[PDB]
């Protein structure tokens, strides 16, 4: 079923984006005075922070490219999670039809 493949595909893709985002953030932030997003372990925690849109404020980019990377993370995360919500709807809508005969 498409909605399930998509969900899954969306999860593997998000994990890729997170990892690539941790890498790209450090590359972008290092070199900028006062920057804090400069070691991979925390950067990875930051990407998870961003994609889930929780945004604590303990870490965030300050360079143009860092922020640009941050926007791809947010958007991939929002889109990905929004797709799970959508696939859960197709499951419910499908099951609610069965329960009515159709």
């Amino acid at each position, epitope marked *: 079923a498409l909605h399930w493949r998509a969900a899954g595909a969306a999860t593997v893709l998000l994990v890729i984006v997170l990892l690539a985002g941790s*890498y790209l953030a450090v*590359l972008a932030e*290092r070199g900028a005075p006062g*920057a804090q997003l*400069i*070691t*991979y372990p925390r950067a990875l925690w930051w990407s998870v922070e961003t994609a889930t849109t929780v945004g604590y404020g303990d870490l965030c980019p300050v360079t143009l490219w860092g922020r640009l990377v941050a926007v791809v993370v947010m958007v991939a995360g929002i889109t990905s999670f929004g797709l799970v919500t959508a696939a859960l709807a197709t499951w419910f809508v499908g099951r609610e039809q069965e329960r009515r005969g159709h």
Partner: antibody
Amino acid sequence: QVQLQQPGAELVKPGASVKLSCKASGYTFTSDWIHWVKQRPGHGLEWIGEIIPSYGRANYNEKIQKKATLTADKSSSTAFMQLSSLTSEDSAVYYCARERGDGYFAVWGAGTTVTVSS
Amino acid sequence: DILLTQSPAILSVSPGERVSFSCRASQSIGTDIHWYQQRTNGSPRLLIKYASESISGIPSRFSGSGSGTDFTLSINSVESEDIANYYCQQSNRWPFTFGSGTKLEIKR
């Protein structure tokens, strides 16, 4: 085994330029950064800059005059520091170190003693 | 850019005694401080990372503690092999920076 190998010494004439090397062995990750640290006799450690080999980007210390230019050779696992127009101020021991992107210098090289004399 | 203050610059302690090295940051940096040892003629060698984490191949004698702006490197029961220069290094904010250093000194 010796993770970072550096030449023992380099002699340079005021104004001339030298190119120091740092050969790495052992585990190498795409998340590695090579650092260069300058130490004058009797004094402390001074960070010069860093290079991310797997990508090739370099950042430098903004407070001190920029006399360095970092490059790296992915194939031979060698990091290079290009010092130009050296003066007596630039004579010192230059160490290279490897950081795994977690902020601390895991291993340092024996360091190359540079001397700027005529 | 973060300034790491190391004072006193020299420390004199007697054989077997406990010694403590101080490192203060000009702003809060969590536990992003690392310690290096450097003997006469040798290159620096990581002693403690992240203010208090052990490194393999280093006498259980060495420990560290602190968080925020005040950090300590302690040697329980000093001994001649520990005579050297000690530096702290921070990785909280770019660029990484080093302390000016503290020399250890034994009184026999």
